[PDB]
């Protein structure tokens, strides 16, 4: 495998892993965020929690897989991103703390205060991570204030508060809308009753919010934010971020779509998928709605990736030392080894996760919860 | 080669515990 | 406090807190698999109740283990930016592969096991439990492989173009001698912890008339598994000591408190006070011709002392200074043929160059005092390592004795005939945790001047963070971990007091 | 180190055969 | 016939005849231990009848195994006086230790097991059976350790004072890489043989309505044990092939019929006719990039050919001629300082010196024709080794397939539902014996020009015996072995036809 | 351990192993040889066979241990002895062939011809080996016709028929008497009835024969056979048989006893033990009789060893190249390793063999045989 082809393949693999994690933990965090907005009773909260209780661990593990894949394929991107967003990563870790404990502990105390506290913890842990990830992505699209020393050591020249500009906040709101839409669609797929109607209404509202936010982000990126241009870079050369030429030009983010009109499908797909899934939900076919929601996640993520195709976390303060997909990559040997390991094991993982979903496909009604009230949490 | 040794050893410990419990269950 | 010390303390607390719940999971999942296998084979429904009751506690511990795992994962990027950027090309493969295979297996099938009782049949449930156990163990396998590569680098070469160490051979990276022994040893220690936990709870039940059906079978399973696992972990501890002697003489010298090289019958200290102001021990209790036999498996093989190691590293310090100067010249774009040819030689001492950089403000001109300071800093604090090693060995011996007594009582068929046996089983509950924490602390503190052995010191591997920025994270995680530990221990106590009869 | 591996392996095979026969005896 | 060839044929026949009964004992004793363990655990008396019935045949085979063992023991002294006098200092330790520990254990406890049914309780009888099995396996361990040292000398140095090779390090003598793999492989092959024997007799019983209680349990035990043992023996066969490739390239080249060195994707022949008049194969069927992957575990590692090995041994032949001249000068009392200093160099080629001594009447003056003859004789007959290797591999694959089918039928609980499965189990009875004899013949014939690899050729290791003196012994042992084989096979057939119901 | 001390210790260990094997396989072959002379019925033959049926394997294994110990400690002695006595070793192997098969096969056919044939085979296998061993020992005491080339290769300059001189025949008769006496004493220890009386008579006759043969051998060695004298030899030197000085002198065999009068106990003990065991048998105490018989075996073997203390298999044709205990020995390292292995394992072997004897101490009466007629052979 050629080094340039290997790097492009691993970039695509990172995109696919992010899409799959987004789908899974997105319906998970949609359940978490719709717990207070839909379930007005303790029984309803128990139903919605047990809807994803069995499979939530296998969805969270996708986040760990994404972190490990970043640490392996793109150690520079991993280090710079998790060092600059130190407070953000601490916040997301504190949020993800509650989800296992909230799932496994709230059903073991009869007191209402304990259940309320753990429900609040679960809601926080399902709400904060998507918003913070959206903020970080928006900052990446805007330019992270960091630079590299002549020795490849990364130092940060910013604070957490400087990441709270309106554009990353809008991106975080968009991510929250996407995850709550995914959770609402999953509720359509499992729950039946008043929860079904409330989840349908929430899904329609989330789809409208996602469409409006995506259009606003597109306009703002078109007319508000300048972009980075990779003038020259050795695709097959060593991963040395310093050895590059890059200049900042207005409207550079749209160059990938203008040069290749075939790439316009991803923004169009990600924009029109929420409408299609709303139509499917109103048509009474939750399966096609879930497929449309998954396509929405994939299209939005890959649109974001294509907009940043030659740049991964560009640096605003220093045009040079901005990490790319060509740079910030491990050596060819370990990259190929990781690629072959992924090709060997990932299909098996998908196969047995699908088998686990198949064996646990029963609907979560009130009578089923009441029959197994002792064990289900 | 300690990985295969550990695999065989843990399976051996599991089977030994199972056999001891099968033998000892009536005697309890 | 210093930023580097604060980050080290944060990683220490996070790792200890995370590993307060990992060995319990490792042991308990296999004991649950044992109970499920017995239920499938014999057909008696008692073992199904046993495995349900123990799986409740297993899930209670597993939730917090998963919670701490995320922080353990992200701490490398949050607090060790330079370390990751330096060694990622070789360190990402185990971390990524573990999450790719073992974490996926355990995460999916633990939910399938908890919620698949009514749907899956007995055989499918047994297979799911076995898959959970194997995935949980393979995750430890890959993590300990990464840690072993940290202890003994293999298949690693520095690259001028990327200013980092890149993987050279995956085969020797996976099968390095330290990693295999470390993995088997830690997994056996986790098995001992789980078996002792089961035995302690069963003994507490048997001390009263509350339970006698579940308690006896659980005690028997725990006793047999604990005896086998304690034998295995003592053997693997001896093997790990041999590997440390072969690979990291400094760590072995710190463990045994050996300052000066002594003839082949080297006396093994059992009690000493390794003061560091004077390179000697205090009121040492020496057993002659003991450490030399164990460390070298023979005689006429002297064990190097700390003073000799420092004297040998002094030329390594000079070569590292030269290498650091050459590397800085290379990095600044000064492409000279002489520099390029010279950097290939004395390339493996760059870690000592970084040590001198820490201990010498000016690299070009260095005085003898700076060299002395670097040599003093080249070794860890001997006393904590020595005492941790002694505590671990003593607790391991006590575990062996207790589990042998329990096995003897179990095979005789008279477990509850002696109150003192049950009391000993109960009071031996904290001993596996004490021993395992002491052993891990000794392992990660014996290599103290090195984030990577002879490659990258820990001081230079830190990221660019401020005191307050790190202190906020430290306070937040410490408070959350304290609250979570309180809640988890309360739930564990409540459901151990409740008993299997409640469900 | 193949001697210890063989010892553990033969004990494992013995215990596996014993367990399989214990499980399968009523089913015959 | 020649005296050396007659002695080689006598040892061949004696070894083959002795090993016609050893793998059966090795497998059957462990299967008897399995049956006794099941009887002790479950408590059902059916397995006691099973173990009695199978122990009858076990003793029938064991008697003749013991009978042949004595001749195998004394043949070294009777027919290989020079070989023993040359390599005894290193070869006596395994032979003596085996008789000291394993032979004693098995000999005492086999009688204790046969005659201790009424006196010893169930637990003591089970312990005695386990001791018998472990002693029987340890005897094979030590014998195969000696044979592995023969295949790959380790810890051996020539001594001028005693004109023999003396032991240098016992640790590496015991733990040589070839010996461990050879031991595990042969023991797993014996397990496969015993399991297939049990399965064949059980299938013969099940083909009729004679037996259905003992037959089904015995078939299940045999199937499970055979599947595990066949997996183990295939893995150990691959490991043995790797070890032979690493240590004895000539044997590997003879096994694969490789004459000329070829690029890294070396095609693995499956069918060839290795003619020796012309150093090439005939109508070869080559699978590209197959043998290189298996032999070297990677690519870019070419496998040497026979021609290259001969070309490399030619300088070794010259050095051996020099060493033999120097050694003869030393032995005649010619104590010259120059000779003493020179003998230390080129000391390890004395075996090639003995080869030249066989192929050159005059050592001082040697022509190119004699060197060519020695080079031709430096390699074994390629065709028998090649065909033996192919036969062994094919029979191993067939054993794997048959035992997998048997295990699948057993786990389903429907063993007698298909007549063809039982017929396949019956007709696969001779296959383990064919494969094991072929493998042993290949092992002991691939090193043909060497009694000890690169140390002592077989031709010079023979004693000083005449044609008639050796022919008398050969005729006597051949006749006695024929009569004993007839009697033993008749008794085995009679008591297999009789069935367990008779007793 | 000093090399000379190590060699002396291993010589003593070889003597002890030979004594133990002689005791065990001596009572075994005494049973084998008294089978036709005592058991006149099929039932009686079955009784006497089952008397030693369980423990015979653990007695035969002593022969293999002796062979392995010779091959390890004294490779030169092993090679020369088993090459010169080629026909003798073939005969003993053919004799030992029958014993396992005779034990395990004669009880599986109802025909009388089969039982008679296997009884004859057992008698041959219990009779020939002691006689041949005695002949070989007598030849050693007389001088084996072999020599060493300047290179340490051994060639034989004799034939099997030349070993049939009267003195080795007398030694073989003495060995046969010893083994049949041991077997008769063992029969006294186990069997009760007419077999007991016949075995007592056979034991008395065997003791008389052993005493007379021992006295005749002593006289013949005193006045008939000249001996070898080891003038000089490096005790701690390398095991090179050529580097020695040795001359043949009449009456040299008695030099060891004359120089050290304390060594006269072994001949006196070996001569007076048969009388003591006859007295014990007539006194009705078979245990003391067995102890006296064991002491007889030990005393006779060690008397033979002391007579050949500095020479192991001397060569008659060539005074030089006669193997000794100082020469014909492995290196110090392997000798010490074998010694420590023996010291570790031999006591355990003795302990569990004694335990096996203890668990199988029941007398072999006719009723016991009839109760377990199906299984006992
Ligand atoms: C003209 O076309 C366009 C529009 O109009 C139609 C737009 O509206 C827009 C604006 C739209 C957006 C900015 C929306 C972006 C998409 C989403 C889902 C919002 C961001 C929130 C998320 C949760 C995304 C998922 C991200 C994460 C879980 C991790 C975020 C990264 C962190 C913490 C640091 C590590 C860095 C990385 C993973 C970068 C990897 C590299 C990439 C190129 C991104 C990934 C994608 C690929 C294909 C590899 C664009 C860009 C456009 O091109
Ligand atoms: C015994 C070896 C071991 C060690 C030294 C560690 N872990 Fe761990 N970890 C486990 C073994 C383990 C496990 C057995 O896989 C756990 C225990 C409880 C659990 O849920 O899985 C766990 C959980 C766990 C998880 C959550 C798994 C999931 O929910 O998908 C992650 C991400 C990590 N660990 C990562 C780490 C990292 C990055 C470590 C070092 C810095 C670390 N662990 C120390
Ligand atoms: C499997 C490995 C193996 C091999 C290659 C051999 N043997 Fe063997 N031998 C056994 C494994 C064994 C055993 C498993 O220990 C036997 C099988 C039947 C028995 O009674 O013990 C046997 C019996 C046996 C006995 C009789 C044991 C006794 O009655 O005390 C002796 C003395 C020997 N062997 C010696 C040898 C020698 C010198 C061999 C090579 C020249 C040899 N064997 C080949
Ligand atoms: C608890 C339980 C336990 C036990 C029993 C043990 C047993 C032991 N041990 Fe141990 N360890 C431990 C826990 C332990 N351990 C840990 C945790 C560790 C860490 C990890 C590894 O393995 O490494 C160790 C490790 C270890 C080491 C190091 C290695 C490395 O670092 O790699 C050493 C030296 C030891 C010693 C020892 C001894 C001598 C013994 C015997 C007595 N340790
Ligand atoms: C029978 C059964 C069996 C089996 C299954 C096997 C399986 C096998 N195999 Fe084997 N082998 C054998 C039998 C066998 N085998 C024997 C007997 C031997 C000899 C001994 C040893 O081990 O060595 C061998 C050995 C062997 C060798 C050699 C080694 C030495 O010499 O040391 C080789 C190469 C082989 C190959 C092989 C292969 C490739 C396989 C897979 C297919 N093999």
Numbering used by the authors:
A (entry chain B), F (entry chain E): 2 to 378
B (entry chain C), D (entry chain F): 1 to 28
C (entry chain A), E (entry chain D): 2 to 504
From the publication, what sentences describe this entry?
Thus, bd oxidases contribute to the generation of a protonmotive force (pmf) by a vectorial charge transfer. The Escherichia coli aerobic respiratory chain contains three terminal oxidases, cytochrome bo3 oxidase, cytochrome bd-I oxidase (bd-I) and cytochrome bd-II oxidase (bd-II).
Each hetero-trimer consists of the three subunits AppB, AppC and AppX of which the small AppX form the major dimer contact between the two hetero-trimers. Within each hetero-trimer, the large subunits AppB and AppC are related by a pseudo-twofold symmetry axis similar as CydA to CydB from bd-I. AppB and AppC share the same fold with nine TM helices that are arranged in two four-helix bundles and a peripheral helix. The heme groups b558, b595, and d are positioned in between the TM helices of AppC and form a triangular arrangement. Heme b558 is coordinated by His186 and Met393 as axial ligands, heme b595 by Glu445 and heme d by His19. The Q-loop consists of six small helices (Qα1, P250-E257; Qα2, L292-T297; Qα3, L307-S332; Qα4, P338-R345; Qα5, L351-Y360, and Qα6, A369-A379) that are connected by short loops. An additional density was identified in the cavity of the Q-loop that was modeled as a bound aurachin D molecule. Interactions with Phe269, Val271, Leu291, and Leu295 (the latter two from Qα2) stabilize the Q-loop and it is apparently this interaction with aurachin D that allowed for full resolution of the entire Q-loop.
